[PDB]
């Protein structure tokens, strides 16, 4: 009901860092017979429940099936990658008001073998 959004991770060991990439989203709620929405994804990076680094894509105006290829990197010793957990949201822009978020979910790190490059699309979920 409120879109899903495909990313990928990956961990840059020449640099220490992981790879975060916002691919796109797709079948985002419109809020009027017939309308749009603004979106941008802001990612946070926690460490149990304590929130530590923030991103934030470009908007892509007026569009359900926004499509970034944007990528943003943490640094983080990959023996810490494990501790951690993602947060994707999903916002609306407006000029005036608040920008409402369209939905979010989480990725816990623990259980990913960073010998990989994930990727997935993941359902958004009321904020």
């Known amino acids: 009901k409120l879109g899903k959004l495909q990313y990928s991770l990956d961990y840059d ?3 220490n860092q992981l790879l975060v990439g916002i691919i ?3 079948e985002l709620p419109a ?3 017939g309308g749009t ?3 941008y994804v802001k990612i946070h990076l926690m460490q149990n429940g304590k929130r530590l680094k923030k991103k934030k894509t470009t908007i892509k105006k007026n569009t359900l099936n926004p499509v970034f290829n944007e990528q ?4 983080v010793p990959y023996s810490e990658l494990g501790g951690k957990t993602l947060v994707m949201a999903v916002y609306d ?4 008001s608040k920008h409402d978020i369209i939905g979010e ?7 990913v073998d960073f010998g990989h490059v994930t990727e997935e699309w993941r359902d958004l979920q009321s904020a």
């Open 105 to 111: 979910f989480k990725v816990p790190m623990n259980t």
């Open 13 to 15: 060991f020449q640099n």
């Open 24 to 26: 796109q989203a797709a």
């Open 31 to 33: 809020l009027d017979m």
């Open 37 to 39: 929405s603004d979106p």
């Open 72 to 75: 943003f990197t943490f640094k």
């Open 93 to 96: 822009f407006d000029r005036f």
